[PDB]
């Protein structure tokens, strides 16, 4: 997490870096298959190490509250 930040930056800054990076690094369900092998490739880019599905998602989440709304309509 934000342990690399040492005693620098303050609570909020490094607290939110940890939370965001924590969720960013979690196992994610692959849209193609359904396996928990989706990882971040870069800013907004995701890919499953299983089926190789390279796709677009949020900057730090493969799915954002807004993208989820799209499907509904």
């Amino acid at each position: 997490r934000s342990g690399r930040f040492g005693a620098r930056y303050g609570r909020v800054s490094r607290r939110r870096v940890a939370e965001i990076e924590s969720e960013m690094n979690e196992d994610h369900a692959c849209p193609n298959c359904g396996e928990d092998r989706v990882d971040r490739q870069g800013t907004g880019i995701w890919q499953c190490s299983y089926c190789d599905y390279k796709f677009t998602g949020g900057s730090y989440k493969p799915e954002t509250p807004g993208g989820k709304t799209v499907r509904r309509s």
Binding site: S13, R16, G57, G58, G66, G67, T69, V70
Partner: peptide, 17 residues
């Protein structure tokens, strides 16, 4: 184009430094 633009939530994380 249909759908929200990719990369949502970029503004969420601080620059820190």
């Amino acid at each position: 184009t249909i759908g929200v633009v990719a990369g949502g939530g970029r503004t969420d994380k601080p620059f820190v430094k």
